[PDB]
Structure formats: structure tokens, C-alpha cells
Amino acid sequence: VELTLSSWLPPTHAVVADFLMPWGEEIRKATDGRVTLRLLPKAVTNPAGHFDAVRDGLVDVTFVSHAYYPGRFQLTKFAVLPFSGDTATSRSIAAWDTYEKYLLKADEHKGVRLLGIYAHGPGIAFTTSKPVKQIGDFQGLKIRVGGGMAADVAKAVGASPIAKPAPESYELLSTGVADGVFFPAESLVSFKLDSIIRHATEFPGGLYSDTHAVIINRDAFARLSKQDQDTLVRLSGRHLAELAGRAWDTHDAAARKVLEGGEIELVKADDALIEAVRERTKGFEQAWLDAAKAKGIDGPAALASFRAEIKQLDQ
Ligand SMILES: O=C(O)[C@H](O)c1ccccc1
């Protein structure tokens, strides 16, 4: 069985080059070639369309951003709140472990098999020409966001979110439609924004983050032997979360040569700015609790579990 894989990111991106490709090699080797992943040479549809591409059987495997589906992945938001996680590795592992233990029964990923979830690193506020040093500096900025938490944060701090998938960021910024972008560090470089962006403000534990899901068509999974199904599952979940998180973190760290290099004015959010953002976003947790209750899950348990686990990992 050869599983087709569609990606809406360039093949050189961390997610593909340093996560999905090595992961596919792990699957091949662990099933003696009986299961392989074939990366299709083009995206088969637009980024948000990738969930349905899998569900409809157009491709066997993909990754989807939880930000790209307004209303549909509300339960993932516990993992991406402002100021909550130092690295993609710790957040990915804690996000998956929490989702697997408490949230799977809510069926947010209806119609496909959910293999695993990961998160990227700390979100940064990047802008083309306008520094962000006090809360008022966000007012009116048109900021490209994925959607989801990034969008919730942009709106809360008084910016005007432009919710579009990541690959649109270069066009929107280069043409001056957007004033800025919420991205993790690596994206500054992989999306080729570092000759446009001149300003960045970093926040302890991130301004926000985003989670992705790796999914497989259910009929395709059913084509594997029981042993190979078990193997694919063993190589997914927490194992996948760690593999992906490590890729993101490695790319984030590489990107610091550009962040720290002098052409970008690099700001560390001061205590006043952080507190102003906390104050604007203070209701987000209760919003998530309310959604958790609506979905029939143990909100306080899941939230407490995630926090305990990420705090420990981060140590
Ligand atoms: O901002 C987004 O669109 C999303 O979080 C994302 C997707 C892919 C790379 C970086 C970030």
C-alpha cells in the first residue's frame, strides 16, 4: 500500500522536509516496505480544502491547520493561548496527550482518522514598518493571521485580522495589503518575508500558537493489515507530535540568525505590553471552557492536565 500525501506547503518547509518525509521513512522501514507515503508533486486543492480531499478519498494523507476552519476545532484552543509554551516540542506533546486523553470523543475530526496533532512554536508579531512596543501600536494594523487563536488575539488587541492561509503571506505583505503577520520565527524565512519585514515583537511563551492535525482516509487505513495499522498508530500520536515539534523548533532556532541580525528591529515585549495583552485576552480561557462543556468533555481536567504537562516538559 502506497499512501498518497498532498502538501499545501513547499517541499523544503520544515513540515515536509523535516517531519513528513522522515516520518514516511519510519513507516516504510517499520512495515518492511508494505506501507509507504508518496508525496504528490502539487497540492491537490487549496489549503483549507485538504480536509475534504482526505475525507472524499482524493488523497490518503495530509495535514490541516485547525485555524483554517472557523467554528470547527474550538476544542484545540486550550493548547495555543497567549504566553503558554516555550517550544513547539513541549506544546505539541502536551497538546496531543491532552487531546487524546480528554477530547477525542467530541468527534471534531469527523469523517477521517485522526493520527496526531502538533503545534508550531511561539507566535511572533511581525510588521513591515510599524514597531509594536505598546498595546496601542496594534490598533488598525492589518495583520495576516491563519485564523483561530491568532485571529482571536489580533482582534482582541485591536488589530484587523486578515485570515488567509500561510502561503498567501508573501503576496499580501509584498503588495502592502497587510501591515504585518502573526507567524512563528521559522516562517519569516521559509515564506521569504525577511526582505519586507523590518520589525518583530516576541513574547514569553508566545503571543499565540496554532495546531495542525495529521489525518488519513478511513478506507485507506482499512487497507493495511492489522499489524501495520497498529504500527502506523504507534508511529503516530505522541511520537508524531514530538517528531513534528522537533522540526519546528529546529527551524525556529535557525531563523534567529535573521531575527538577531540587525536589519529587523527586534523587540522583547515589556511587562506592560504583556499585561495589556493578558487583559485583552483574559476571557479566552472561559470561552474554551464553555465550548468544552458544550461538547461534553471535562474542560477543567483537560486544561489542568495540559498546563501541568507543558510546564514539566518546558522544565
Ligand atoms: O499562520 C498560519 O497560517 C499557520 O499557523 C501556519 C501554517 C504553516 C506554517 C506556519 C504557520
Provide a descriptive summary of the structure in words.
Helix content is 43%, strand content 17%. It has 315 residues and is an alpha/beta fold. The protein has one domain (1-315): D-Maltodextrin-Binding Protein, domain 2. It has a 6-stranded mixed sheet. Bound molecules: (R)-mandelic acid. Residues 65, 67, 120, 146, 150, 165-166, 183, 187, 210 line the site of (R)-mandelic acid (RMN). It is classed as solute-binding protein.
CATH architecture: 3-Layer(aba) Sandwich
CATH topology: D-Maltodextrin-Binding Protein, domain 2
Radius of gyration: 19 Å
Number of E strands: 11
- Order of strands, main sheet, comes to 7-6-8-5-9-11
Largest sheet: 6 strands, mixed
What letter string, H or E per element, gives the SSE order?
Answer: EHEHEHEEEHEHEHEEHHHEHHH
Coarse shape: globular
CATH superfamily: Bacterial extracellular solute-binding protein, family 7
PDB class: solute-binding protein
Keywords: trap periplasmic solute binding family, enzyme function initiative, EFI, Structural Genomics, solute-binding protein
Assembly: monomeric
Entry title: CRYSTAL STRUCTURE OF A TRAP PERIPLASMIC SOLUTE BINDING PROTEIN FROM BORDETELLA BRONCHISEPTICA, TARGET EFI-510038 (BB2442), WITH BOUND (R)-MANDELATE and (S)-MANDELATE
Give the tags.
about 325 residues, alpha/beta, D-Maltodextrin-Binding Protein, domain 2, six-stranded mixed β-sheet, 12 helices, about 45% helix, binds (R)-mandelic acid
Concise summary:
With 315 residues, this protein is an alpha/beta fold. The protein has helices at residues 14-30, 50-55, 88-103, 148-156, 169-174, 185-190, 218-222, 226-234, 237-259, 271-280, 284-294, 299-314; strands at residues 2-5, 36-39, 61-65, 113-119, 123-127, 142-145, 160-163, 180-184, 199-202, 211-216, 265-268. It has a single domain, classed as D-Maltodextrin-Binding Protein, domain 2.
